[PDB]
Curated annotation (Swiss-Prot):
GO terms for cellular component: apical part of cell; cytoplasm; cytosol; extracellular exosome; myelin sheath; plasma membrane. It comes from Homo sapiens. Activated by X-ray, histamine, L-adrenaline, L- and D-phenylalanine, L- and D-histidine, L-His-OMe and beta-Ala-His (carnosine). Zinc. Can also use cobalt(II) with lower efficiency, but not copper(II), nickel(II) and manganese(II). Changing A63F: Reduced activity. This is Carbonic anhydrase 2.
């Protein structure tokens, strides 16, 4: 009855309801590291999450969102390719059924186990809904996950997942520090793209970090116990909730590093 990540409603079908799926600046893409251009004029990336106020975690039937208070400039992304100030509104992940798949962006065709998206909106547009209608409305910070050592800063998220197993379930999720999800280095690639889920709006500056974070097999296994379905419905494990790479078309990926 609507969009998802199965054979019958997955990414290959989305263009019928959302023709922009075949548009000029769709995401994700493959990042060909030997085609990206170092840009020495890119300003340093500024992640300012000290005053972040998390509120709630929600299973929306596609992923889970950790939501933040974005009523003021409490957690912001600036610098790099960005003009102005972008406010953190939520983060979520995309992940696979197996460790060898799950990311949306790929790097020289390599798929990672998962990908974290920290979603920010351009404050010059006043609200998120207006921002998504602008070509520079959003900035999404993308971070790859590989399976190795546990990420301590992820554990609070993992442990609450039992309480939001099914579509529509939410739980209080205050006092979470998203700085615990970042890698050491802020080296990145950047390109103009889109939301990777319907409505696939072409409003995103993508900033994808080069350094993955490591999470444990046990942590990702717990992501994979979530459900796409609602309570009291036949179980559909929430896995493989990623859109594959889309054609780059008339775009350039810039690198912050050589
Ligand atoms: Zn996403």
């Amino acid at each position: 009855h609507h969009w998802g990540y199965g054979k019958h409603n997955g990414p290959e079908h989305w263009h019928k309801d959302f023709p922009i799926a075949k548009g000029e600046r769709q995401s994700p893409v493959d990042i060909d590291t030997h085609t990206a251009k170092y840009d020495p004029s890119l300003k340093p990336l500024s992640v300012s999450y000290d005053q972040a106020t998390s509120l709630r975690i929600l299973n929306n039937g596609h992923a889970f969102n950790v939501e933040f208070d974005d009523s003021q400039d409490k957690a912001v992304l600036k610098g790099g390719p960005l003009d102005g100030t972008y406010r953190l509104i939520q983060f979520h992940f995309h992940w696979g059924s197996l460790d060898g798949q799950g990311s949306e962006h790929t790097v020289d065709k390599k798929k990672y186990a998962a990908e974290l998206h920290l979603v920010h909106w351009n404050t010059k547009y006043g609200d998120f809904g207006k921002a998504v209608q602008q070509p520079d409305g959003l900035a999404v910070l993308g971070i790859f996950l590989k399976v190795g050592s546990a990420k301590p800063g992820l554990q609070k998220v993992v442990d609450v997942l039992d309480s939001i197993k099914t579509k529509g379930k939410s739980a209080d999720f205050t006092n979470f520090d998203p700085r615990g999800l970042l890698p050491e280095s802020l080296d990145y690639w950047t390109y103009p793209g889109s939301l990777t889920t319907p409505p696939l709006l072409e409003c995103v500056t993508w900033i994808v970090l080069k350094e993955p974070i490591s999470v444990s097999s046990e942590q990702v296994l717990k992501f994979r116990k979530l459900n796409f379905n609602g309570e009291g419905e036949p179980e559909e494990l929430m896995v493989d909730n990623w859109r594959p790479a889309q054609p780059l078309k008339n775009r350039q990926i810039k690198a912050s590093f050589k």
